[PDB]
């Protein structure tokens, strides 16, 4: 600690006083993972290996829940030419938890797959299928010439009144009009049937051959995790500082039995600061109180390097059961200084009416402050004390007036 | 007819525990002191719009109401959701129902066809007391909250306060714009409750030590 004080002061000599050199934080003893006990694997097969993909104008949405979703196999598959994830990295997907994962599958012409991303523009992004600007998920596409080719069954919407909102789909088939005439059920002046087929010939030009594209969308705000990666739950431990992971909720703290009256549908509890402070263990279903691991500033009491190299360390606001002479001072328990029942003037303050000093074979002592010498004034209803002499006292007083005029 | 909702219809916005805290939240709440339509269905049950969410309340001695119907066309053309409680079980299913002009239950009735979802469990309606419900359909989730309270006021909602807690939370994800309640009758002559629509409002919720909402403030009221 003396070298720490020298280092933080950036000086080889240290004056008498108390210096905050570093911050103490009891480290996590173990790592804990508690994922839900879901056994069944996730039906990604029927999403990607489906017999037929819907047209881009009428993209098909599947809802995915109650999964042990293995995204490593999808990521490592060589079929996918484009594996792009925006709100999450592909490697991390095997260790996250999601609620109500969606999978939007549809077929699309090749080079225009770049329109499938946040903030894009173009006919597919504008008028057929649009992702939100804050999209969190992955866009997965691959060549499908050997399956979707010629073939003319698949279509895409060319004509439409306005840009689509995110994740809406248009099924209307009425004749759009670009001209002013009422083109009611007829392709009149500058009027067209809104849907026209793709020309997926078996050897169409590069970028025109069909592409099957699947878009995975993840929701994270909702409490109960239903889709989770294939992590392995660790045995639970309580009453010690550990790294914990409940349904993807990474954190560090001390887990303790909770008295909070969680209802069965409730999984988490939030503090007044709107931070998670309680959690239901997803296997035992018991409620565990989360508290931060003990921490506090570290202060070094130094008599001065010119006086001695001995020092005492104060760990602020901690109990000495967590720290690894020892004394439980109210302002954080103090080590390296011996408590003494005497009382002296405050040499080096610590807190809570306790100070430390270097005194007599000398050592750093710790004592309660003596406010002053006791005095009982000899008051009586007919007694007065009058001075018979005097002393002229000259006392110096120093006052700052100015400081240097920097510019 | 119309009546005044004296701070009724507030519910737990999310399924997260909060205790001894005043929480400000933005969600589709029923405005305080709003006009709730009072339907004297017993001397009928019209199809009513579903304006982003509905607050439904009723009080009868004989539990005439037994369920609800949701959808857009309420015919075979579009998917529709059915909830109904008979004497022993609830049944929730989402099918292209061909609903008749007057849906009800006899001393028992269904129109299901060609569908995907079904569920059964104990009934939340049972055989004086006020039954309140709040319906929502957002982000692909269809949700029902509920709360049952004894009362003594005869022909108006009580002045008291009680938050509605979740009762149903399903990821049905169907389009809903209209709904209609259904009743149980001792007759089959095919040809009472309050309704109020939710609005986006900012509320301040007082959570007590036990985690229950004990009071609330409608920030835009006054």
């Amino acid at each position: 600690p003396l070298s720490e004080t020298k280092c933080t002061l950036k000086s080889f000599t240290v004056e008498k006083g108390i210096y905050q050199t570093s911050n103490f934080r009891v480290q996590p003893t173990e790592s804990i993972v508690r994922f839900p006990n879901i056994t069944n694997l996730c039906p990604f097969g029927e999403v990607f290996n489906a017999t037929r993909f819907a047209s881009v104008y009428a993209w098909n949405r599947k809802r995915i829940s109650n999964c042990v979703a293995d995204y490593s196999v999808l990521y490592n598959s060589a079929s996918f030419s484009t594996f792009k994830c925006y709100g999450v990295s592909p490697t991390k997907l095997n260790d996250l938890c999601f609620t109500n994962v969606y999978a939007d599958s549809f077929v699309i012409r090749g080079d225009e797959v770049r329109q499938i991303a946040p903030g894009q523009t173009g006919k597919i992004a504008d008028y057929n299928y649009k992702l939100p600007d804050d999209f969190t998920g992955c866009v997965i596409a691959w060549n499908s010439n050997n399956l979707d080719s010629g073939n003319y069954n698949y279509l895409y919407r060319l004509f439409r009144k306005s840009n689509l909102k995110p994740f809406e789909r248009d099924i209307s088939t009425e004749i759009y009009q670009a001209g002013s005439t009422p083109c009611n059920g007829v392709e009149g002046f500058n009027c067209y049937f809104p849907l026209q087929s793709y020309g997926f010939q078996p050897t169409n030009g590069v970028g025109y051959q069909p592409y099957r594209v699947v878009v995975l969308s993840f929701e994270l705000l909702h409490a109960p995790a239903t889709v989770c990666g294939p992590k392995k739950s660790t045995n639970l431990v309580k009453n010690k500082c550990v790294n914990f992971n409940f349904n993807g909720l990474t954190g560090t703290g001390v887990l303790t039995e909770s008295n909070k009256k969680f209802l069965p549908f409730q999984q988490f509890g939030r503090d007044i600061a709107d931070t998670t402070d309680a959690v239901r263990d997803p296997q035992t279903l018991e409620i565990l109180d989360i508290t931060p691991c003990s921490f506090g500033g570290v202060s070094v009491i130094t008599p001065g390097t010119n006086t001695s190299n001995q020092v005492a360390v104060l760990y602020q606001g901690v109990n000495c059961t967590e720290v690894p002479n020892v004394f439980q001072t109210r302002a954080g328990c103090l080590i390296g200084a011996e408590h003494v029942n005497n009382s002296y003037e405050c040499d080096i303050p610590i807190g809570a009416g306790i100070c430390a000093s270097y005194q007599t074979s000398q050592s750093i002592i710790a004592y309660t402050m003596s406010l002053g010498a006791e005095n009982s004034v000899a008051y009586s209803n007919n007694s007065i004390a009058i001075p018979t002499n005097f002393t002229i006292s000259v006392t110096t007083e120093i006052l700052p007036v100015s400081m240097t005029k920097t510019s | 007819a119309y009546t005044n909702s004296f701070t009724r219809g507030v519910y737990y916005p999310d399924k997260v525990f909060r205790s001894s805290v005043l929480h400000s939240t933005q969600d589709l709440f029923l405005p305080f002191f709003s006009n709730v339509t009072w339907f004297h269905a017993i001397h009928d049950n019209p199809v009513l719009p579903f304006n982003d969410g509905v607050y439904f309340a009723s009080t009868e001695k004989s539990n005439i109401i037994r369920g609800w119907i949701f959808g857009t066309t309420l015919d075979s053309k579009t998917q529709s959701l059915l909830i109904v409680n008979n004497a022993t079980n609830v049944v929730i299913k989402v099918c292209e129902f061909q609903f008749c002009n007057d849906p009800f239950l006899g001393v028992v009735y269904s129109s299901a066809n060609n569908c995907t979802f079904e569920y059964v469990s104990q009934p939340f309606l049972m055989d004086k007391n006020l039954r309140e419900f709040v319906f929502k359909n957002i982000d692909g989730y269809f949700k029902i909250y509920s709360k049952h309270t004894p009362i003594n006021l005869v022909r108006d909602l009580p002045q008291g306060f009680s938050a509605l807690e979740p009762l149903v939370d399903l990821p049905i994800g169907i389009n809903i714009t209209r709904f209609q309640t259904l009743l149980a009758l001792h007759r089959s002559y095919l040809t009472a409750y309050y309704v109020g629509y939710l609005q986006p409002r900012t509320f301040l919720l007082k959570y007590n030590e036990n985690g229950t909402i004990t009071d609330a403030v409608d920030c835009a009221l006054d």
Partner: antibody
Amino acid sequence: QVQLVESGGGVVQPGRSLRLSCEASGFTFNTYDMHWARQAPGKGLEWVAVIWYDGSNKFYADSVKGRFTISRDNSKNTLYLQMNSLRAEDTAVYYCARDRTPVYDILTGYYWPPPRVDGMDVWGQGTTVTVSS
Amino acid sequence: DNVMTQTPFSLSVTPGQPASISCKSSQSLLHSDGKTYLYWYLQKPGQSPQLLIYEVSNRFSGVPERFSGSGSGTDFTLKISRVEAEDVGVYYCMQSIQLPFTFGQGTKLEIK
């Protein structure tokens, strides 16, 4: 079949503490509330205590208030009862018993009936606790 | 407290004869949900109790059909259509409307 196996009996002196244990198998343990009940010899049954499915809510009978602590560990499928501060009248056979009503499966969207304590469904083998000088 | 009683303290029944054993309570067992909360348990000589009737008229799964019961308010009774030899034991009635769960003092059933 529903299996409950009590353990932790024997003879003891007044004033000390003891632990009973109940193994459970053959059903989803963590979703069921659990009861402790006892039968003193030659006298009728007596409900001792009940624990909630998550262990959140605990209740005990008037004869045992302040003293007994009911606890469970859903990971091990075990139920416990800490027998602090014994007197002679605690001489009895003790049974761990299941609650008839399990809580609703939250993975389904339906949250009715509210979780409530109900009578004893299935009773275990039972063990004898004798406290006397 | 919901004190409860059963009479007669011991009923002696020939094999095959019907039997009737009663239970009573101080306060009504009807709950605000509409259910009437009464539970009955059979304890034959030499093992733990067995649940027979879980609501006033509802027999537990696996119970033989001969067991049946009825009642309302504070008066309840269980009927046995015909007493067989294994029915010997002590019958305990219990309320579950409020905690603590209070049993009756128990009533013996024996062969004449």
